[PDB]
Design a protein around this ligand. Structure first.
Ligand SMILES: CC(C)(C)OC(=O)N[C@@H](CS[C@@H](Cc1cccc2ccccc12)C(=O)NCc1cccnc1)Cc1cccc2ccccc12
Ligand SMILES: CC(C)(C)OC(=O)N[C@@H](CS[C@@H](Cc1cccc2ccccc12)C(=O)NCc1cccnc1)Cc1cccc2ccccc12
Ligand code: HEM
Ligand code: HEM
Lengths: 436, 436
C-alpha cells in the first residue's frame, strides 16, 4: 500500500484509504451515494483508491471535455480493464488503442441514420407482439412485471436486429478483483471467463449456422467485403456485446420510464395526447413520426437524468498529462460521476423531482452537455445511442397508444435504487395496466 | 519438480515425468488407455505424477482390499481433493476424516433395503411415463436418443425420490488444476465455484420451500430429530450430490445397456423372455420380482464391467504405511484402475466381448471382488449402489416389456468411448425402437 500516497502528494483531497482495500468499504451505499457524498465533501475534483488503483473524479465541464474529447486519442483512449475476458478482449467496448480504433471504424456505419431507418419497419413488428402480450396480462386483474415484458420485447428486438431470429419471447465476486486484480492474469490462464463457455459456444457456431439485409450480423458480414478486415470470431464477440446492451439497458430504462409515467399521471396524459396528434387513429409510428414527438423525447431525456444507467464514465490516463492546469500522472483512472452530476443541485433545480420541462426547447439550452451525459461523449461515446433511443421510443408509442399505467399496492413508491453494483431498482417495477 | 524423484527412489517403476506437467500429456488417450497401457508396460504396481502429485497404481487384490477396507479408517480415509468446492465441501462424497464419518453415519439409513422398498411403488410411475414418451418417438420412423429419454426418466426419478417434485421432463479447465493445484486456495477466496451460485441458490431456498415420507429430503429432515445433528445447508449440499449421481450415472449406464442389448439381439431376447416369465401379462414389476430376475442382473453386471463409469478408485494415504510388504509414504494418492482391471485378459477371457454368462451363478464365483468393483468397496463404496441397481432395473423391465431395439445407419458400431474426461460415448447412442 505504497501507492496510497499518490493523492496526498499531488495535494488532491479525498477519503483516507485503508491498507489493501483502498476506499472500497465505502461502496456499501453503492457507487452513487459514495460519489454524491464525495462530490459534496470535497468539490470539483477528488481522489480515492479501488484497492491500490488510484481514481480521480473530475466535475469541471472543460476538464471533462478535455478528457472525453480533446485528448481522447492521445491520452485517454481506453477504459479500466476488468478481466478475465478471454476471446472477448476483441469486443469493441473492451478493446484498446489501435485495435479499438480499428473496430470503432469498422462497426460505425452499422448505426447510421439510414441503417436505423431500414430497421424501423422491422422493429415495428414486436411492439405489436408487446401489446398483445400486454393485452392478456391486463384483460384480467393482475399486476404486470415490466422487466418481464420489456425484456421479452428487448430480446425480440435483439434476436431480429442482430441475427434475423424472429421469436416470441414467451417460448458477487467482482469485489475481489479490485483487491486482487493481480489475479486476473491468473484466471486468464485457467480459461475462467466472466461468461460461461456455453453461451458463447452456443453463438460461435450459431453465427455460422445462419448460414449462409438488415440485421447487425449481415451488416458486419457485408463489411468483410484503411485498416484490415473483420475476422470471424471478432464478429461473434461483437454480437455478444450488442446483445447485452440492447436487452438489459433498453428494458431497464423502459421500466424507469413506465414508473415515472405511472407516478406522474399528468406527464403520462400530456404524452398520450401527443402520440395521438402525430399518429391519429393509432397510426403506426415511423422513423420520422418518432423524431417528431418532442414531449416523448423530453420524457426519455429526463428519465436518463434520474437513472443514468452507466452511472460513471471512465478513461485510463495512458501517460503523464496536464489537462486544464492539473497534472495527472500515468496509470490513474479518470472518472466522471454521471449519476452525481445529474443529481447535482448546482446545475439542476429540484434534482430528485421528475420534471421533463427541463428539456423543453424553452429551457433545453441551460444544460451543459458535459454535465448531462447518459451516452458518454467524444470518440468513445455510446455507438448505440440513436438505435437505443429509437428502439425505446418505438415501444412507448405503441404501448401508450393502447394502455394506461397505475400504481398498485405492491408498487415501490418511492423507487429504491439497487444499493449494489448496477443501476437497477431494488424491488422490480410492478404497475396496474388498463386498456384505453 | 523436486517431487518427481519419489518413485525412482522407492524403486517403483513408471513413465518418466516431464517438469511441471508430470505425466499428464499421456491423458491424450484418456485415463483409461493410459492405465491399460501402464498395466501392460509395468505390471501389478506402477507410479506417475499428476503435475507434482505422485500417484501409485496397485492391482493386487490383497493390496486393494487392504487400502479399500482393512486400513480405510486409519490410513486411506479420503479421496483426492479437487476444489474449488465452496459450501459443498460439506457433501459426503467430498468430506473427509471425522466430518465424513459423521455424514456417512447420518445418511446411510436413507439407503436401506426397507426404504428402497418404499421407493419402488413410487419409482414405478415414471417408467410408465418413460414408455408413453417412447411410444410417441417410435410410432413413427424416427430414431431415438437414449440419453434424452433415459435422462428425462432419471431426472423424474430424482426430483421425486429427492424432493417429491413430480414433473414430466418434456416440460475443460480442470487440466490447469493439476498443473496449478496451488491455485485452488485462490479460487476459494474468489467465491469461484465449480457450480454456478444460481443452481445452488435455486435449491438453497427451494429446499425450505417444501415446505413445510418417502423422498430423500424427508428422510434427511427426519434424521435431524453418537454424533451431532445434520444442519440446514449440510442437507442442501447432500441433495445436490444425490442429484448428480442419480441423473447422469443412471441414464448413462442405461445407454450402455440398451446399446449392448441392441448390438447383441440374442441377449435381448433371452432377457425379454425372463421378464415375461416372472411378470406375465406385463405384470408391474415389484421390489421382489426385480431381485428375482437373474439374467437381468447378469446383463447389468456385465455392462458395468465394460463401462465402469468411475473408471478409477482413489484414496489419499494420510500417513506412512507398509501395506502388504510395500512402503507407501504419506501424501501419495493410491489409485485402483477399475476400467483396466475390468478389461485385463489375465482375469477375463475375451474381455472386450459382451458376455453376460460370466455372471451366471455357474461362473459368478471365478470373479475376484477386488478386480470387479463398479461401486467401490469397503466403508467408502457407493452409498447409492442398491438404489442405482433397482432404479435402472425398474427402467429396463418396463421398457423391454414393450419395445425392442435395433441398430440404425447412425448407430455408432463399435461404440467409441469418450477420449476425454468422463466415461461417456463419443457420438450419442441412437437406435431404432419398435413396439411389441
Ligand atoms: C464488474 C463491472 C461492473 C466493474 O464491469 C462489468 O461487469 N461490465 C461493464 C463492461 S463491458 C459489456 C457488458 C458485459 C457484462 C458481463 C460480462 C462481460 C464479459 C465480456 C464483455 C462484456 C461483458 C458492455 O459494454 N455491453 C454494452 C453496453 C452496456 C451498457 C450500456 N451501453 C452499452 C458494462 C458497462 C456499463 C456501463 C457503461 C459501459 C460502457 C462501455 C462498456 C461497458 C459498459
Ligand atoms: C474434475 C474431476 C473429473 C477430477 O472431478 C469431478 O469433476 N467430480 C467427481 C468428484 S464429486 C460429485 C460430482 C460433482 C461434479 C461437478 C462439480 C461438483 C462440485 C461439488 C461436488 C460434486 C461435484 C459426485 O460424487 N456425485 C455422485 C456420484 C457420481 C458418480 C458415481 N457415483 C456417485 C465425480 C466422481 C466420479 C466417479 C466416482 C466418484 C466417487 C465419489 C465421489 C465422486 C465421484
Ligand atoms: C438506454 C440505452 C443505453 C445507454 C443509456 C447507453 C450508455 C452508454 C454509455 C454511457 C457508454 C460509455 C460512453 C463513454 O464511455 O463515453 C456506452 C458505451 C457503449 N454502448 Fe451504450 N448505452 C445504451 C445502449 C446501447 C446499445 C443498444 C448498444 C447496441 C449496440 C450499445 C453499445 C455500446 C457500445 C458498443 C459502447 C462502447 C463504445 C466504444 O467503446 O467504442 N449501447 N453506452
Ligand atoms: C450406475 C450408477 C452408479 C455407479 C456405477 C456408482 C459408482 C460409484 C463409485 C465407484 C463410487 C466410489 C466408490 C469408492 O470410492 O470406493 C461411488 C461413490 C458414491 N456414490 Fe455412487 N455410483 C452410482 C450411482 C449413485 C447413486 C444413484 C447415488 C445416489 C445417492 C450415489 C451416491 C454416491 C455417493 C454419496 C458416493 C460417495 C460415498 C462416500 O464418499 O461415502 N451413487 N459411486
Amino acid at each position: 500500500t505504497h501507492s496510497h500516497g499518490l493523492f496526498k502528494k499531488l495535494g488532491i483531497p479525498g477519503p483516507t484509504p485503508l491498507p489493501f482495500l483502498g476506499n472500497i468499504l465505502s461502496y456499501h451505499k453503492g457507487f452513487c451515494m459514495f460519489d454524491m457524498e464525495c462530490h459534496k465533501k470535497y468539490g470539483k475534483v477528488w481522489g480515492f483508491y479501488d484497492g491500490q488503483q488510484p481514481v480521480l473524479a473530475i466535475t469541471d465541464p472543460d476538464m471533462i471535455k478535455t478528457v472525453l474529447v480533446k485528448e481522447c486519442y492521445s491520452v485517454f483512449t481506453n477504459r479500466r480493464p476488468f478481466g478475465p475476458v478471454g476471446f472477448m478482449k476483441s469486443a469493441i467496448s473492451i478493446a484498446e488503442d489501435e485495435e479499438w480504433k480499428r473496430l470503432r471504424s469498422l462497426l460505425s456505419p452499422t448505426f447510421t441514420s439510414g441503417k436505423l431507418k431500414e430497421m424501423v419497419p422491422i422493429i415495428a413488428q414486436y411492439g405489436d407482439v408487446l401489446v398483445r402480450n400486454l393485452r392478456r396480462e391486463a384483460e384480467t386483474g393482475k399486476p404486470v412485471t415490466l422487466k418481464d415484458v420489456f425484456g421479452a420485447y428487448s430480446m425480440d428486438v435483439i434476436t431480429s436486429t442482430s441475427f434475423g431470429v424472429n421469436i416470441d419471447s414467451l417460448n458477487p465476486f467482482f469485489l475481489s478483483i479490485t483487491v486482487f486484480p493481480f489475479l486476473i492474469p491468473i484466471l486468464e490462464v485457467l480459461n475462467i471467463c466472466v461468461f460461461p463457455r456455453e453461451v458463447t459456444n452456443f453463438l460461435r457456431k450459431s453465427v455460422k449456422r445462419m448460414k449462409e439485409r438488415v440485421d447487425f450480423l449481415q451488416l458486419m458480414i457485408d463489411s468483410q467485403n484503411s485498416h484490415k478486415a473483420l475476422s470471424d470470431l471478432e464478429l461473434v464477440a461483437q454480437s455478444i456485446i450488442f446483445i447485452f446492451a440492447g436487452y438489459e439497458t433498453t428494458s431497464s430504462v423502459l421500466s424507469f420510464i413506465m414508473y415515472e409515467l405511472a407516478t406522474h399521471p399528468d406527464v403520462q396524459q400530456k404524452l398520450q395526447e401527443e402520440i395521438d396528434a402525430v399518429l391519429p387513429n393509432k397510426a403506426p409510428p415511423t422513423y420520422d413520426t418518432v423524431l417528431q414527438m418532442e414531449y416523448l423525447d423530453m420524457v426519455v431525456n429526463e428519465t436518463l437524468r434520474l437513472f443514468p444507467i452507466a452511472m460513471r464514465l471512465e478513461r485510463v490516463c495512458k501517460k503523464d498529462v496536464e489537462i486544464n492546469g492539473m497534472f495527472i500522472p500515468k496509470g490513474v483512472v479518470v472518472m466522471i460521476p454521471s449519476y452525481a452530476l445529474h443529481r447535482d443541485p448546482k446545475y439542476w433545480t429540484e434534482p430528485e423531482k421528475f420534471l421533463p420541462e427541463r428539456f423543453s426547447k424553452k429551457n433545453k439550452d441551460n444544460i451543459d452537455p458535459y454535465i448531462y451525459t447518459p451516452f458518454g461523449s467524444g470518440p468513445r461515446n455510446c455507438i448505440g445511442m440513436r438505435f437505443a433511443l429509437m428502439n425505446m421510443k418505438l415501444a412507448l408509442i405503441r404501448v401508450l397508444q393502447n394502455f394506461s399505467f397505475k400504481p398498485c399496492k405492491e408498487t415501490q413508491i418511492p423507487l429504491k435504487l439497487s444499493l449494489g453494483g448496477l443501476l437497477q431498482p431494488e424491488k422490480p417495477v410492478v404497475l396496474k395496466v388498463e386498456s384505453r
